[PDB]
Amino acid sequence: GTTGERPFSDIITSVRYWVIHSITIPALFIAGWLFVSTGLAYDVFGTPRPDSYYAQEQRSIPLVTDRFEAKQQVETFLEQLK
Amino acid sequence: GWFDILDDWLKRDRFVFVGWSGILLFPCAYLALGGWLTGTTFVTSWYTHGLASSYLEGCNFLTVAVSTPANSMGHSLLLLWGPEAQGDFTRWCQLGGLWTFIALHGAFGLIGFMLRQFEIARLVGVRPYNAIAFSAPIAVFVSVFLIYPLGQSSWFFAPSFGVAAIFRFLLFFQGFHNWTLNPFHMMGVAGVLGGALLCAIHGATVENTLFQDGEGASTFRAFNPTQAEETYSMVTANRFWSQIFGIAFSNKRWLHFFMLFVPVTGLWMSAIGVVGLALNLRSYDFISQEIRAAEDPEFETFYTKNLLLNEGIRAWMAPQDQPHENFVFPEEVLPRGNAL
Amino acid sequence: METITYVFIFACIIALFFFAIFFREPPRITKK
Amino acid sequence: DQESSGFAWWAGNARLINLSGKLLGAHVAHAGLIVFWAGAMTLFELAHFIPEKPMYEQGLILIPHIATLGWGVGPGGEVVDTFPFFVVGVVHLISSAVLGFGGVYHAIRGPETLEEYSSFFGYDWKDKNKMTTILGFHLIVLGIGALLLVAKAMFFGGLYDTWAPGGGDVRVITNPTLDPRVIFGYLLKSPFGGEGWIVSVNNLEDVVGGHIWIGLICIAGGIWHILTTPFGWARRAFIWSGEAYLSYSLGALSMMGFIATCFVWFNNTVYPSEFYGPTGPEASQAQAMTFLIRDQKLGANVGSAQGPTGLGKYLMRSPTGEIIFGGETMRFWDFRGPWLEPLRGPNGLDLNKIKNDIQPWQERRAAEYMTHAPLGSLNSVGGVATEINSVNFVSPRSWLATSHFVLAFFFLVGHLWHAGRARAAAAGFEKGIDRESEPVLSMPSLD
Amino acid sequence: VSYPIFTVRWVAVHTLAVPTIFFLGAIAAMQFIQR
Amino acid sequence: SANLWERFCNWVTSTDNRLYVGWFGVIMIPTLLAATICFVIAFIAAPPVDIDGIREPVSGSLLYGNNIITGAVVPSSNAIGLHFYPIWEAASLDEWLYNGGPYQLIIFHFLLGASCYMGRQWELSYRLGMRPWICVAYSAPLASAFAVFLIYPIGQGSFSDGMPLGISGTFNFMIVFQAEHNILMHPFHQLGVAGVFGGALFCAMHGSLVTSSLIRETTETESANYGYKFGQEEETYNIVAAHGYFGRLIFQYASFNNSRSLHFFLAAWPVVGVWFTALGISTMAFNLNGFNFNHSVIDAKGNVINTWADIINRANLGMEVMHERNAHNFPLDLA
Amino acid sequence: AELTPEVLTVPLNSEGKTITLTEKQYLEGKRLFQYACASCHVGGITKTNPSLDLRTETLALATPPRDNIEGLVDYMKNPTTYDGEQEIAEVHPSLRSADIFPKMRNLTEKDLVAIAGHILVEPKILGDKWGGGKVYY
Ligand code: CLA
Ligand code: CLA
Ligand code: CLA
């Protein structure tokens, strides 16, 4: 009923754990926050910002229409201030 | 030999068993789950479906999804380093590259997982009836997420990984395939619904035919983890159902195999039906019915009623559900009943 | 012809039900 | 005192079955939670309440309960003074501390058992005399309460009557129906379409009157149970244990929960459409009205208009000949309402009144109730499932009905569960089949 | 016993725990984006 | 005779009957026999029914052009609504069959009997000295029949809107429901499939695990089932070997070792899930529908950015716009 | 793709003169439009009379012209039929009938202008959607 690993109960209870994780856990959180709040996430995944779905006048959708020249076609969609 | 030493290490009894299978399972399984959780929050479906599909855009747990690639892509594998994305990651995301990522990876993850079942069973020295059972969920994933779109025009018509994105996959199959009218599908639900019955009825039967092996009311503690006597009266259970239902089990070994057969057989039947929907070889109509309905304007069944619902589904959904077709349906051509 | 076919199978299932319940194999205890 | 050697943690409250003292603490602490909610919620509702705006458009379910009793409202359900709402809220909220106090006390300080610290309050589940006596007590307390309503209605102000002659207004009932033939007649009414059983009450005279009867009958049976014991049949039929008694009361609440669901959904009188929303039928009726009103002004003869099916676009006949509204609204021809009745004749909707007696207040009433049907989504988006986000609204009649059905149902399960255990507890096998003496093994084989 | 620290379990746990909170932090920030 | 009535009560309650006709049985057996007989006759030979009360008869019987898949017993007319419509309420049987008379006779008899069927599932458990609560598990499928045949009609104000008694008729009930209530986007329904998927899952889980960990007592060319005799003392499978395997499949503490904790979970999950799905239909019977995320996410200018929820709405519109063609005369469907 | 003041420029009166609303006014109008209009005029339609919508074109061919701030505002005080040959304040929400329509009691001239502006700005943004019904959903 037991193996080499240190019983979670002990670790989650050990003061040393929290001394570590009161730093680590919030760190990742603030990191993830900055990833979004700095608009970096938008560029990493090409996700459009609220003002970047259409052009001002245009009401059409930037649908990719061919596989091989898709990447080129996509960049062309960003051109029209989209 | 290094091999047997590598073996030794892998097959070591840890908290989370690795094993040879683990070399295939864990990488894929993690990337599959990761790819979804990634796209779910960050990646969009604008350039592929004209849809918002991430938390970053404002979608919630229900409306989020990792949408299929464009219809332009075809059945392209959409490799990160392929002709489409051309090594680019951002482009890859915007072309729905994460879908083929989740799909293909997850697929092998399901392979590794069944392999794990096989490998672990062998070691423990138990029968692999856990691996045989797991074949049904495989067939479904294979038939639905791979075989089906492979029969259609592209990956675009595969079910997108997401809650709402699956609901439309249901409504689509109704509208276009009349999927509910398919015999293979009927067997499907018959297995799942009947399987969810066996699960319920057997558990309740056992808990309420138990022997008294303790002095407390909470009889949970009063169980012997080390086999010995049967914890519940199989004989009493027999006489019970034999008098309320007329029929009853009397062979635990059959009763449990039956609990394996029913739901596994069901999912397999539902798979075959989907395999037929790939070639669009659906069970849409009854020729005898249509012929009378044409000649006779007063002939109406619940079957005729349903088809009218399908026509409505197809007409009103197709435009925004199939952007690549550039559909334009004038108000006057839209099929409508009275008032509504 | 079709109606006849549908009722027939149905009638056969009900017949089976009968035999299944009242003409089953007697469930014998221990010494089986 | 009580631990694992009694029940499991997840069945903890069952360790108190034989601890009268602590078991009293629970019921008193619990009763505080009910008063607490009623109080704190009322103040919550009032804090958001907007006077010059319909109550049903504000997610109110307590303030309209007060409004019905003739408090802070006037002509047409117009909100006059918000003070009675504030009072009812704060008074409750206060009493919750008092109850909560005793609750906490009896459960962790006071006597763990009562039988010794007071033989009057101490009790035995199998003591058929004490049980019917304690029951007799509550049977009176509830009885006086029923008269508390009668008093408010006849003396201390009255109730909101939507059927008010000059139009919906607070009225003092000074003529309660006391005729038993009429009163108890309701119980002999069908529960289906038309004859609506208890829910079919359509005037406050019966409401007040009925409560007079209940009030007396309740106290009467209260005294009866004080001064008696269960008979012969009464003892050989029921199961006498702490759990059994619970079960009996569980199914009782379940049944009342179902009745309440239909009441808030169908009844117009004791659930005013002015404070609550328009009832389901009322809203569909209003649409028929609205467009009958419109098209007629365009010069259409509603009487002879032929719909697609050839049934009657605006007006048709009921299965018994009465003139009713057309369309799918044919199912709600059993609807009665203040705004609609003046158009009704001895044979149903009168074509002459319809043609030139339509009043403006009726037209906008029909328009109002039509655009406020009890249709909405879980996330509170008024309309059909295909509607667009804009109108944040879900009729109070919808909230109440659905909530109280889930509760009512689960209580019917709670019933089955606790009644099934009690029968097994009494006879003594609620803990498993006797390995030695297995009953089934002593019965002949049916095979 | 003298338990170790870094183990295979430790690795596994972190492969899920570390990204999770990073995502939970990311999503939490999204609740304030507008237009 | 010890006493006629006393003997009567002893025969009914007798546990020596091939089929336990209980006290609930005294109501069950007649009601169910009436239900089934009328059904069988209707499904085969019943004439078309004006379900929507718009004088537009829908034939759902075999003899009238239907097959098993299409055939159904058509709900009572919408002109009747929630009114009670017994045979003795009609000028003739011809009128009774036209207005969907049989439907009420069936559903009422069924729901009554099916309720007593639950009541009987307690009684026999009582007479045999076994624990009850089996009927409590049967309360979930029963509460669904109630929700579908009685609760939804009450809420909607007509029995014509109750689920038809047939295959294709059942499909119609769903498609239309989805349109008007968007059931797929409702939590209770989602919990329903969770119990149902999970059920079939767990049913396969348990089934496989047990049958795979059977103690060897059979030949190589002999059915592994014969390795069990009806009325055994000891267990027929190694539950400790089962836990050993499944414990390694995921991880030890995520595996059951208590057979009683197992079968409880095996029973609890589907029953609870179906309970909610039953409450779903009963809740949406008062038009408290699923989540409405139509036109939720919009861009910086105000343009509507569609989601899958919007794609669902289009499909729903098609159903709405097309269902019950000639039944509607007014813009809003509020009935 | 944003709500520019170029978009928030709607006709003030019949004589061509225009007015430019602010993002504060828009939001305020939009909120007020939900408060006292959405009930019947959700998405620019009219539930109690589908024959007349809130399309700019429809408001233009009205009598008097209601396709400008002044027009709509007048309507919100003294509403008429499409030909204007009949006052309908008794069965339609308005200032001179706030006793009958309590929602209109709070509403001040600032609110009226905001609501009026909203009706003119929405079609500029939504387009065909604003006018049509379920078809364009
Ligand atoms: C064992 C685990 C495993 C497996 C089976 C896969 C499998 C796959 N991954 Mg993958 N991946 C893994 C782990 C794994 N991954 C890990 C841990 C990561 C994180 C770094 C990734 C990250 C990742 C990304 C980012 C992508 C994939 C993709 C893919 C798919 C296409 C890859 C391909 O073309 O294979 C190629 C197969 C091989 C290279 C095997 C070759 C083995 C031979 C024996 C070696 C011979 C070499 C020699 C020089 C040949 C000489 C011949 C001479 C003529 C030149 C495929 C399903 C792609 C995908 O999903 O596209 C949609 C994709 O874009 N993977
Ligand atoms: C008047 C109402 C009433 C009363 C007084 C009791 C009293 C009792 N019940 Mg009970 N019961 C009731 C109604 C009632 N029941 C109903 C309606 C049902 C049907 C669901 C049940 C089902 C039930 C079962 C299945 C069992 C009991 C048991 C018991 C006994 C032990 C109490 C216990 O287990 O607490 C423990 C309490 C809990 C563990 C709390 C449960 C929390 C619930 C399930 C969640 C509620 C959801 C909530 C609204 C959402 C909150 C959101 C959250 C994030 C905060 C006790 C005598 C037990 C017993 O020993 O039988 C005799 C037992 O096994 N009851
Ligand atoms: C309505 C809810 C309710 C109520 C009134 C009670 C009441 C009670 N439970 Mg209980 N219980 C409940 C829900 C409830 N339970 C649920 C949902 C569960 C499942 C998780 C349990 C599980 C459970 C177990 C397992 C046991 C009890 C026991 C008891 C009894 C003794 C309490 C005790 O040990 O004090 C201990 C008190 C404390 C440790 C301090 C708690 C602080 C107090 C009580 C709350 C203060 C309230 C408020 C903030 C103060 C207001 C003050 C103001 C008026 C001035 C008591 C009658 C025990 C029993 O059988 O009695 C012998 C027992 O063993 N309960």
Ligand code: CLA
């Ligand atoms: C049970 C009766 C009842 C009814 C009919 C209402 C009705 C209402 N409440 Mg209300 N409320 C209640 C009890 C009730 N409340 C209680 C007990 C509390 C104290 C917590 C509150 C606190 C409260 C607040 C703070 C507010 C309301 C508001 C409202 C209104 C808006 C409804 C809404 O949006 O909710 C939608 C709610 C949901 C969709 C949540 C549904 C939760 C379900 C029941 C969970 C079921 C899961 C199940 C239990 C899981 C267990 C299974 C497990 C054991 C396996 C509406 C009139 C709002 C209002 O007035 O604004 C206009 C408001 O702000 N209520």
Ligand code: CLA
């Ligand atoms: C369900 C309600 C209820 C019940 C049955 C009891 C029962 C009991 N309490 Mg008690 N208590 C309660 C609520 C209740 N309490 C509340 C809410 C509080 C908080 C204020 C207390 C605080 C409390 C304390 C501090 C003490 C008790 C004690 C006792 C015990 C001795 C009897 C006693 O003190 O009465 C004596 C009083 C009377 C016999 C007459 C009281 C009449 C009051 C003043 C009028 C009540 C009016 C009522 C609301 C309307 C009813 C009239 C209507 C029919 C027309 C007894 C078991 C004592 C104890 O533990 O001893 C064993 C003790 O020291 N109680």
Ligand code: CLA
């Ligand atoms: C909720 C309050 C309440 C409760 C719990 C009780 C409880 C009890 N009363 Mg009772 N009683 C009450 C109020 C209450 N009383 C009132 C207010 C009065 C004054 C009218 C009486 C007058 C009274 C008398 C005169 C007698 C009792 C008796 C009894 C005991 C046996 C009951 C029995 O076997 O009935 C079981 C009932 C039946 C077997 C009959 C079933 C047929 C029912 C009535 C019709 C079907 C019900 C249906 C589902 C509901 C539809 C509604 C209907 C109108 C259509 C029991 C302890 C008896 C006793 O033991 O004396 C001490 C007794 O002789 N009661």
Ligand SMILES: CC1=C(/C=C/C(C)=C/C=C/C(C)=C/C=C/C=C(C)/C=C/C=C(C)/C=C/C2=C(C)CCCC2(C)C)C(C)(C)CCC1
């Ligand atoms: C794609 C990709 C990749 C991958 C990545 C990864 C792998 C990631 C991961 C990620 C992750 C891994 C994430 C996670 C997340 C998570 C989350 C975010 C969670 C959340 C949760 C929640 C929210 C919860 C809730 C709940 C429940 C569910 C139950 C009940 C209660 C509660 C409420 C608590 C790579 C780079 C390789 C390559 C490229 C591409």
Ligand SMILES: CC1=C(/C=C/C(C)=C/C=C/C(C)=C/C=C/C=C(C)/C=C/C=C(C)/C=C/C2=C(C)CCCC2(C)C)C(C)(C)CCC1
């Ligand atoms: C036993 C027990 C329990 C229970 C408990 C209870 C149930 C309690 C209760 C309690 C209570 C029941 C309490 C109450 C309280 C109250 C109070 C304390 C009140 C107050 C009030 C006030 C203060 C008022 C004032 C005001 C006003 C008038 C207005 C404005 C604002 C205010 C609010 C301020 C538990 C489960 C936990 C555990 C176990 C044991």
Ligand code: OEX
């Ligand atoms: O019936 Mn069937 O469908 Ca419930 O909704 Mn209204 O009425 Mn009719 O319309 Mn849709």
Ligand SMILES: [Cl-]
């Ligand atoms: Cl239809």
Ligand SMILES: [Fe+2]
């Ligand atoms: Fe089992």
